[PDB]
């Protein structure tokens, strides 16, 4: 019963903190991370990254 | 609030629900969902699946 966005993602966020603590080179460890990073807006931030990289349009 | 593993492994999976429910099929739900399958594969098991040749 996980009633919103938020609190999944802080949920998810909790979880990568264990196994990243518990079993830091672990599948779970890794695919968990990747999950929480896909969770927050990601898009937005590479395409800032891609930008600054080629510097004009 | 986490602790134990199985707990951990609980919210993880309610948290893959959540995601294929509200997000199905996003990067999230995916690596959430394979994430929750390879929570259950044992240290003896994934120390050689991860690199097998």
């Known amino acids: 019963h996980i009633q919103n966005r938020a609190q999944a993602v802080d949920q998810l966020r909790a979880v990568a903190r264990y196994f990243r603590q518990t079993e830091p080179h672990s599948p779970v460890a ?28």
Do not use: C, F
């Open 30 to 57: 890794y695919l968990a991370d990747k999950a929480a990073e896909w969770a927050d807006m990601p898009l937005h931030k590479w395409l800032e990254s891609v930008v600054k990289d080629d510097g004009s349009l």
